[PDB]
From a paper:
Microtubule associated protein 2 (MAP2) interacts with the regulatory protein 14‐3‐3ζ in a cAMP‐dependent protein kinase (PKA) phosphorylation dependent manner. Using selective phosphorylation, calorimetry, nuclear magnetic resonance, chemical crosslinking, and X‐ray crystallography, we characterized interactions of 14‐3‐3ζ with various binding regions of MAP2c.
Although PKA phosphorylation increases the affinity of MAP2c for 14‐3‐3ζ in the proline rich region and C‐terminal domain, unphosphorylated MAP2c also binds the dimeric 14‐3‐3ζ via its microtubule binding domain and variable central domain. Monomerization of 14‐3‐3ζ leads to the loss of affinity for the unphosphorylated residues.
Residue numbers in the entry:
A (entry chain A): 5 to 233
B (entry chain E): -3 to 2
C (entry chain B): 4 to 209, 215 to 233
D (entry chain F): 5 to 10
Write the structure that this text describes.
């Protein structure tokens, strides 16, 4: 039952059991109907946490693998552990991207939710690319880029510069440019433009979106400081 | 269990 | 499947905060059947502390919600079954540790310190089991928690100095068992004071003892008020 | 990732 899956997701959220939270929002999605705003946000928060934990663990272990160069057996054990974590990463990404391809992007009937889901697709493709090998990596980076660009174009036409989804999209696309394509210039200019446009139309920032937009605007301006230093 | 690039 | 390799994995998992992997590794180290080093014992203990601690913490949240939803009966029921899901996990974790304790760690304990450490751990996991046990089951399990702490207490009194952190840690958890599980504030307070008292006699010599002594005092303040 | 009475 949809009501029930959604309640479970909320309980799991309260219990900080994000794997369960994701599983029931997965089930809610596979029922095939367009998610409400609440459901979409639940789903995204759940997988944010699921994927986030693994990305964090990956970084720690990758860092150890680096610092153990010279101690070849220690490094090997780190390397194998990192691959374990990578296998989980791929699976989670592939799960969300399949959800996006089969359910969420097809069923998105308003511009806002189209942009939300294309952004999410760019995100999970980015995470995938971060742990993909050789020729497979190039192709996945490109899928990330295309999903963000399409999102970016729709948002430019349909959403105010103060809209948290359009800002969040600008933040993450700028991060892609910086961290994935090694373009600080392009990253910085995207971040700068989104930030400046939000300020210039600050009058449009609604009461309900105030907290999320300003947090993102903070992340944009911090990123911009770091990059141009 | 970790807020992630978003 | 090598002990050196299982231990390094346990350490990597700990850094990565993947406690389930950390436990499984240390479980495997235990199941090779030789007495754990101090290092390996502490890894095992930390790992399962974290694994079980996640579920205890989750259970408290969902349990609190179940209570606060009385009247909204279908919603309460959703919380109730989710609590049961978490309980099942909790029982599994406790059963895993108690089986390790029974087959390997207690029989292999060759020194007083480590025997006490593991009996305390047995009291601990029996305690956690008892907290989500039913009716006549609970009674039996509380008794097993009490027997393990009492054995531990008796060996520690005879064979460890009053300052030892394992001996003090045992006093802390045993007195907590009395307060929280058996509803005996008088017994809890008495046990905590006696242990603090016996430790102070030899603080002149030696740390982590002080930190446990402080926890004893803290519990005492809580319980009296 | 939580620790308990132990």
């Amino acid at each position: 039952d949809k009501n029930e899956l959604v309640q479970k997701a909320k309980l799991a959220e309260q219990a900080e059991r994000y794997d369960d939270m994701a599983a029931c929002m997965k089930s809610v999605t596979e029922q095939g109907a367009e998610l409400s705003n609440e459901e979409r946000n639940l789903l995204s928060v759940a997988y944010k946490n699921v994927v986030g934990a693994r990305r964090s663990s990956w970084r720690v272990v990758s860092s150890i693998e680096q610092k153990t160069e010279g101690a070849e057996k220690k490094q090997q054990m780190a390397r194998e552990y990192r691959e374990k974590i990578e296998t989980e990463l791929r699976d989670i990404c592939n799960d969300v991207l399949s959800l996006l391809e089969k359910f969420l992007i097809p069923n998105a009937s308003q511009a806002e939710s189209k942009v939300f889901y294309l952004k999410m697709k760019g995100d999970y493709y980015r995470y995938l690319a971060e742990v993909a090998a050789g020729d497979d990596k190039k192709g996945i980076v490109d899928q990330s880029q295309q999903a963000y660009q399409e999102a970016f174009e729709i948002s430019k036409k349909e959403m105010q510069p103060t809209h948290p989804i359009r800002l969040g999209l600008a933040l993450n696309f700028s991060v892609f440019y910086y961290e994935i394509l090694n373009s600080p210039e392009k990253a910085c200019s995207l971040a700068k433009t989104a930030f400046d446009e939000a300020i210039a139309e600050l009058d449009t920032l609604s009461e309900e979106s105030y907290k999320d937009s300003t947090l993102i605007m903070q992340l944009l301006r911090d990123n911009l400081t770091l990059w141009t230093s | 269990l970790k807020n992630i690039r978003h």
